[PDB]
Design a protein around this ligand. Structure first.
Ligand code: HEM
Ligand code: HEM
Ligand code: HEM
Ligand code: HEM
Ligand SMILES: [Mg+2]
Lengths: 306, 306, 306, 306, 304, 307
């Protein structure tokens, strides 16, 4: 088999997301760092095992792919598509390389980002840096448990990893990132029961609302999607709270992994464009997207053989 | 028996430092929050015990003291004094209120900061916000172990807490804060042995250099101070690394606690102004101060009664 | 000078409460066990240290005291007083001996209870046995954080331990126990905001309601009491959830420790008999008392002396 | 593949065993709960991961199966078979549904039991509820280590999961439960060496007795069984201590999982009816069975597609 | 005065180092003594809070007179040999003791390495033992070890020199003996017979009742009452050690007390017996091959 | 397919290495103990789960194999080959049985060793006994992080376990042991930068030196080897510090596992005999080998199905 990157990670309480663009002439410096990134992860993380749980997933954008590599393109790799809905917009922002860094502690994420950015100085321009923290009981910036219905084990592997549909790229995945800022004032003005109707779960106990009470425009209803077979279409998410209390900046950095970008893009269309029964996802009345990018995260042996 | 604030804390791997100025007319809102800050600490932290280890130490500046309170001033409270050395300068920057927030996780620091700044909205202007992280083996941004020679137990209590010398304020302490930015490139250009001559301890094993090889201008030599009786004068320090890899900002946020600011100010004079044997602390050839402020952290019962 | 029992314990996730009456002729068997109870605690607990945190607090009722001992009575020892309110009743039930057994695991509590009851077979009749468990985020059976405003450190010692006011019994405490069963159907019919008006704290974040919106008949308002000097009167509580899902028994086992029973009894009078502004504690509309007893927990050296 | 339920769980120190009958007319409410039980397990357990280790195994009895489902039946599903031995009896008691709930803390077990029974109120009658706790060194109520010779990994999967011998029910297992009470007075009247001859292993070190000293009527000799091919026949056991010190109730709740009930029933016949060499298992001279039931635990996809 | 870390948290690992001071080694020794506390902080700090590293430094009677002028601690004298009818407590040489404890052997070894590095060419090693506790606090005989140690203020009153010897307040006396066990003979006894040797139940660690506890059980003989009828207590941290290949199965005994009189009265009852007991039955399965006595000064004494 | 022994273990901070020779006539006692070693592991270890992480890997030497078992030999089992280099020697020392015992605590390793040796008394003679401890940040006796480039997961299983190339022994592995003593005085006389040119990685941060600076005779350059297709050949290491401060004994006990002894023996030839670019591994100028032995660690089912 090919060795995937650590897409399927254990639960982690800390993350750094780095998005960067490749300057004129930066290609060779980038290809060098890509062939070393797995060995840098071992160097920073190994001495802190078993508690550190440090990992890095590397993604490459559509335009960056053609600057870096000759030969085939992964069949689903394209630039993020903007959605201009009746009320809400999903923007596209620039990005060539993503580093999704996770661990039990921010300091280990920081030490790996420092070695990666040290090797790229003068080849890349930073577009975004986010220092994520999960709340001690797995809660998100809105006060709800985050991750409950993610797939696990073999269902997670089937949902996330490219297979025989695109054999040269088996063991890869597609990552969509969006930085959201929340209107926390408007959100905390709702009763808990009104917040539960926005999400589609109980806030304190995390039990799903039944199909007879769950509104059509609740976040859980709109991100539930069935294929032609009537099989559930799933993705793997690891969204992280972030912010600054001084600047009144309270955010969710969304990341979702899927075997094909079509599943994530169908969920975004239902959220932003609505359906027959729902104008839009109620969660977008409290959350504004300010970034949007799409990346292919190759199998680790692809990056190693550079 | 006055109750000190949690100046003497267990080791913590995460911190938020908040420094704000009090807007004109903000006095009443500030005095209200001060009388509730201990109950806010309990509310956010209690449900995360015993691993959270959340605490908040609240400091008040010299000029803020006069706007907030009638009656006595603590004997040692004055504005931070600028040091204009031949090569290096310790700047004085504005601050009325300090919140030193510590825990095992950044998310807990953030939830308490969020409730404090919620209560002060419209009454204060943010001057500094720093999210600190300690490395997993107690190392700082320069790669050295940080905290080793801090006093513990009764020696710590005698070094840090105001007593019979100023009985109205017994159980208070004085805090000095300074934000440093490092020249990491210049630092990593030194051999380990040359780094050890700058600090005055072995890098890997944390053993102090013997008095016959320790340079007079090493950091440990200059911050070792004896009183008139020939006793060691100690302070309690809890400096944290911080940074942004995107902006190439690699920093140490210094905080020192002492029973009287004279001990901390004598250390700063030796570091910046030098002695007969040393022009300046060699650590300042790799570290620039961009803030400097001084605060009195009163006994907890003082804040509770106002 | 006297050694208190482990009244001030570290947080524990498991407990057993054993209340027994002394059969006629049981006196000598009981006095023998009381002089050995500390050595049994060490025998069961030592091999699980330091994580086990096994402790047993032993209490003696007013009528039992007179059967067991000649000489002085603790000044405040009397039988629990029944409270006959217009709507709610605090019943008095028999109890000669209390064993308050706490640890990080149920199995350790059970092994010490097994040795204690082994020594007392044929000298005592069991009146109550409760196996308590804490929820993983310090929540009680109603879904609220329990323990938040307990006193700590020196304020805990001052609030709980008998001193110079009763010198022969210094290092003792008084314990009040009540078993409550909840109407969980009626409780879960309230909105979260209506539950918050019953307790007097926010449910998810545990922040106290501000003094102008906290109802006078909320639980927190009625159990806040000021002495003549204007000081807060405090007790130390370690209440535990318990239950059987099959019998629909959802309960709180209340225990409160105080230096004098007057403080605990003033809180119970406000809850059950009301004030000018509150007919009764709203928590009693969802909580029925089915036991009530009062015990003196002597200094450890008092039990050893026998 | 079919997905099995969590029959092969990690070690857990807490359990709840719930056995109910289905009331007349209750069928529809039960089939609803069965299709939701996995979603309830994720909802209660997710926020405690990865330490919580919460899992629920659902079993259905022979008579209940015929009330709930039409069509083909698991080949081995029948009501528990009573064993009337010369001295000892294995009773059959009523049970239609089993919930085997396991976690690292009792409170997590209790919260999932509460949500299961909340959905079944008015459709089922409780027959048995046991709160199990393991001793801190894996010991049982007799003072011996319990679980040592359980199969692990692939040998465990082969021992427990239905395969090609019953292809419509692949991924299922058969569970036998028995609640035992011990005569602890009679037991503790044996020497350690006499206790070792009852079990067939050393008490302090858990080393199996040599084939030259292991008695024919020791527990390990009688539950050791070889098939016609000379392979070991294994089951997976997760027996838990339970009891009440006040009632002098000291028990073991036995559960055994096997791919066919023939293996568990051959072990029970040797224990209760004896063999050529042994009248009965000596463990039954200190252990009385007061319940006995048999359940089929289907693959998880069976329960989901209801 | 600040005591050394005599009263430590429970630890699962220890190194015991006993050395003699070579002629001319005195100055090198006095230099290392004034730095041992800063070496403990250096090695241990970065491994907090799990490390639990401490070093207790002791000085023998003969070594005291070579190192220091002025007062002697009142109770400091050479370990006394006990020539009993059946069992012997030997006296073996020892000038300096380092009792190193932590959660992990590697931390003990790193501190030992820095101490012995500073003393190279000034000292000769007499004994080095790497100790390990079993996961349920059991010792080499299979019994729970440490159960009756005093705690808190009763421990401080039992262990630390006070007003009776004010120049040395905050010090303690340490007695060490290395024991080797006859494990074959021991495992030949029934559990019940082992319980009569110790005076405690093996599985549950409950003390035997006063009507069944033999007079020559280990717990009966090491129970000693003062004139007022109070228990005289010591603090013990004995550790298992061994080599499986050389069939060496041992207990390294260390006991701390405010005066050596308490520890020496217990050793006289064990080895010489009384009217009621020939000797401690534990000595029929345990041979002492070292014996030494040290004063562990207050930490401020080592600093000055 | 079959059950391997616990060759691929979780990280462990404590280990006991026991090497013994089988006395004449000891064969039957040895074969008895081999069929019980897995049940002895369960007995001592189960009650300490989940923290104990106790395991035992049992190895059999080439000459012991012939005395114990009458059928086929594993294809690669032979006595350790001595390497007589210009400067440095890798000696071959006697050993018939290896017990590689690992856990989170030394006491658990010691209790299993005690039960194993109890069953073997009078049938075997002890040749080596080492009580190993790892430093709290995975560092070795030289102060460098040890284990960093070990393979993990499926790459580890492919590197270590016998498969279709030798089907009767599938799920087995080959273990090489060497006890090294260090010259710590000579080592601590080097600058940190000079230590880094000996190893080939940075001491504080464990980052590999660039291909532009990494010397030909650094330890990392010489133990990197590519097969004919240009794939890396890998082994799995679990080397442990050991010592006695009194005797000035500071050591590393090396153990390496591989699917074929040819990978480990090629690395040892480059270290001790050198190449075109390097006379010898610079690590050997501060490390002397005092033992060397080779063992086959069979599949667990092989030990169990015995007599
Ligand atoms: C804008 C900020 C967002 C927040 C705060 C948020 C929050 C949540 C929460 C609380 C849940 C329920 C617990 C869980 O299953 O994790 C959830 C579920 C989910 N979210 Fe989001 N979400 C956000 C954005 C998105 C986006 C952008 C997507 C996909 C494009 C998405 C897809 C999902 C999916 C697929 C589920 C699982 C649905 C199910 O139960 O089947 N979410 N989210
Ligand atoms: C660049 C900013 C700073 C860095 C990176 C730094 C770093 C360190 C380090 C690595 C040590 C040795 C380990 C320890 O005992 O903590 C130390 C010691 C110390 N530092 Fe700093 N320091 C900084 C600024 C300051 C300032 C501004 C002062 C005082 C005004 C100070 C006071 C001390 C003192 C008192 C010691 C203890 C020395 C002793 O008695 O051994 N440091 N510092
Ligand atoms: C081979 C050497 C030794 C072994 C294996 C050993 C073992 C034990 C054990 C298992 C206990 C009972 C539980 C507890 O720790 O309280 C005990 C108690 C004790 N031992 Fe020892 N011991 C040894 C040597 C010594 C020596 C030489 C002394 C005194 C000089 C001593 C003094 C004590 C004392 C005072 C107690 C507590 C007595 C009490 O219950 O008041 N031990 N020992
Ligand atoms: C004194 C003995 C030794 C010491 C102190 C030592 C130390 C080291 C160190 C510190 C590393 C780097 C980090 C890592 O991957 O672990 C390493 C790597 C390595 N050592 Fe050793 N080692 C020793 C002996 C040996 C021997 C005898 C072999 C093989 C016969 C060996 C094979 C390796 C290999 C294959 C690597 C990984 C290199 C790579 O591909 O990056 N070592 N060793
Ligand atoms: Mg009975």
């Amino acid at each position: 088999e090919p060795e995937p990157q650590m897409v399927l990670s254990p639960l982690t309480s800390a993350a750094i997301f780095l998005v960067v663009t490749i300057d004129s002439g930066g290609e060779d410096t980038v290809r060098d760092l890509l062939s070393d990134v797995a060995s840098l992860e071992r160097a920073v993380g190994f001495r802190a095992q078993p508690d550190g749980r440090l990992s890095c997933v590397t993604g490459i954008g559509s335009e960056a792919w053609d600057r870096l590599f000759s030969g085939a393109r992964p069949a689903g790799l394209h630039p993020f598509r903007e959605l201009d809905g009746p009320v809400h917009r999903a923007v596209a922002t620039p990005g060539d390389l993503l580093f999704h860094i996770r661990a039990s502690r921010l300091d280990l994420c920081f030490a790996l980002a420092t070695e990666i950015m040290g090797r790229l100085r003068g080849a890349v321009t930073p577009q975004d840096e986010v220092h994520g923290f999960k709340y001690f009981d797995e809660r998100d910036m809105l006060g709800f448990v985050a991750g409950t219905e993610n797939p696990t084990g073999a269902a997670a592997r089937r949902a996330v990893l490219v297979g025989a549909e695109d054999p040269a790229f088996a063991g890869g995945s597609y990552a969509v990132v969006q930085k959201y800022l929340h209107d926390i004032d408007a959100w905390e003005g709702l009763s808990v029961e009104a917040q539960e109707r926005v999400i589609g779960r109980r806030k304190m106990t995390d039990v799903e609302l039944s199909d007879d009470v769950k509104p059509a425009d609740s976040h859980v209803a709109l991100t539930s999607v069935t294929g032609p077979d009537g099989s559930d279409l799933e993705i793997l998410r690891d969204a992280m709270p972030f912010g600054s209390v001084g600047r009144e900046e309270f955010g969710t950095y969304f990341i979702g992994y899927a075997r094909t970008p079509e599943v994530t893009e169908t969920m975004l269309e239902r959220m932003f464009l609505g359906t027959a029964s729902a104008p839009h996802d109620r969660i977008l009345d409290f959350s504004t997207a300010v970034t949007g990018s799409l990346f292919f995260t190759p199998a680790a042996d692809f990056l190693e053989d550079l």
